[PDB]
């Protein structure tokens, strides 16, 4: 099979920059025909991969100028003149010059903007949850930047371990920031043993880390 | 060109997996499959006329046919395992003749297939309740399998929406949040209200979300 090696796997480019992205096979992509079947794809987030480029260097109906192919035989290129907000995504080659086709491993764009501090909201559990015999406690941190961030679950100032799950979005499309969800999960008897329930944010844009808190109860 | 993709999203190991696309020249179509979190991998391809191409990873455990009449193109894979969970992707392009054809121009919207022996099960939606911004959501517990779909407002809403990537505990469930910021000051005027849709159990769920009686 041929081999299809992306270059670089992430893509970190500042607003209005160019940005190239390297494709290399292991065997020539020209076919017998004279063509060579190399093509590229963006991938946005939640979305179907979205064709840009076919014959290395031919761009699709509706594609954007700013998007650029070329290469010959084993090294291809694809080259973005200046990169926009709505570029953010993964972008893969394929060749189906040869059986099996093949894919690269992708590249994800994103954008280094600014420091963007989170903003942190916690979440008591509902009441009717409460009903069935769970809580789950959720924390909020909304359109930060970069994607690093460290939650902290406290409950009545002890530190939790192994009870919580948390999920990033991809970077947004418009503001090129992160958000994160972190639920806690009790039994309702662990959660009626405690008053203070606590998360603890750390991030780059917050001088001092942020505690968002509410005590058992209280409405 | 537009493609309509269709199938079960659940089998059992060991069964077939079937998935169906409708294009909307003559076509030459292929199907393309994605892990969840990983990169593309292509499956086969039908020709103008009918040849097939397959890949060899799949140890011939995989079929794509034509219906006589229409554009209609059919994946069958054959003994399934975990490592077919993806999502299933057909893709066309125009076939004008043997020196004209194309590959991959236009794809249908995915189609996740999880194989697992677990039953269908609908989810339970709870209200995560709230200057100048407040945020506000939707918990979204215990289903199977994934996906769900949240829209705010009846899909009115949708500025500052936040729909996570689903976790999946240990109980072998999916749990997700959908939040959304709204000016603090709209929350004594406007109605909040998440649509929960789990289609493999067939299950819409409409859910106010607001603040906790005092
Ligand atoms: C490698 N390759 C290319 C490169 N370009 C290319 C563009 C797009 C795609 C693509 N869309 N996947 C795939 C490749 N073109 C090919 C045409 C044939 C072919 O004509 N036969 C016989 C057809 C019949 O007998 O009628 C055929 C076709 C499919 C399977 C088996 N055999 C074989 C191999 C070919």
């Known amino acids: 099979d041929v081999v299809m090696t992306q270059s670089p796997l992430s893509l970190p480019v500042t607003l209005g920059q160019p940005a190239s992205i390297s494709c290399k096979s292991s065997?020539?992509?020209?076919?017998?025909?004279?063509?060579?079947?190399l093509y590229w794809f963006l991938q946005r987030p939640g979305q179907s991969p979205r064709r840009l480029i076919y014959l290395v260097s031919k761009l699709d109906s509706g594609v954007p100028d700013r998007f650029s192919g070329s290469g010959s035989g084993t090294d291809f290129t694809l080259k973005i003149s200046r990169v926009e907000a709505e570029d953010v995504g993964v972008y893969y080659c394929?060749?189906?010059?040869?059986?099996?086709?093949?894919f690269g491993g992708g590249t994800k764009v994103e954008i280094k903007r600014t420091v963007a501090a989170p903003s942190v909201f916690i979440f008591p559990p509902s009441d009717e949850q409460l009903k069935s015999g769970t809580a789950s406690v959720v924390c909020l941190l909304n359109n930060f930047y970069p994607r690093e961030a460290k939650v902290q679950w406290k409950v009545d100032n002890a530190l939790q371990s192994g009870n919580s799950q948390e999920s990033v979005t991809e970077q947004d499309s418009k503001d090129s920031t992160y958000s994160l969800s972190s639920t806690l999960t009790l039994s309702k008897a662990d959660y009626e043993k405690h008053k203070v329930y606590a998360c603890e944010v750390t991030h780059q844009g917050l001088s001092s880390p942020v505690t968002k808190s509410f005590n058992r109860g209280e409405c | 060109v537009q493609l309509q993709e269709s199938g079960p999203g659940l089998v059992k190991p060991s069964e077939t997996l079937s998935l169906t696309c409708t294009v909307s020249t003559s076509y030459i179509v292929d199907w393309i499959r994605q892990p969840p979190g990983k990169g593309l991998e292509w499956i086969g391809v039908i020709w103008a006329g009918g040849s097939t191409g397959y890949n060899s990873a799949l140890r011939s455990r995989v079929s794509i046919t034509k219906d006589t009449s229409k554009n209609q193109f059919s994946l069958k894979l054959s003994s399934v395992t975990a490592a077919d969970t993806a999502v299933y992707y057909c893709a066309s392009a125009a076939y004008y003749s043997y020196y004209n054809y194309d590959g991959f121009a236009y794809w249908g919207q995915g189609t996740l297939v999880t194989v697992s022996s677990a039953s269908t099960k609908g989810p339970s939606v709870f209200p995560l309740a709230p200057g100048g911004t407040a945020a506000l959501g939707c918990l979204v517990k215990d289903y199977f399998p994934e996906p769900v779909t949240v829209s705010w407002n009846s899909g009115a809403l949708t500025s500052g929406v936040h729909t996570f990537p689903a976790v999946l505990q240990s109980s072998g469930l999916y749990s997700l949040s959908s939040v959304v910021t709204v000016p603090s000051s709209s929350l004594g005027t406007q109605t909040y209200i998440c649509n929960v849709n789990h289609k493999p159990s067939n299950t819409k769920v409409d859910k106010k979300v607001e603040p906790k009686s005092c």
């Open positions: 065997q020539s992509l020209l076919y017998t025909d004279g063509k060579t079947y």
């Open positions: 394929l060749q189906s010059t040869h059986f099996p086709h093949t």
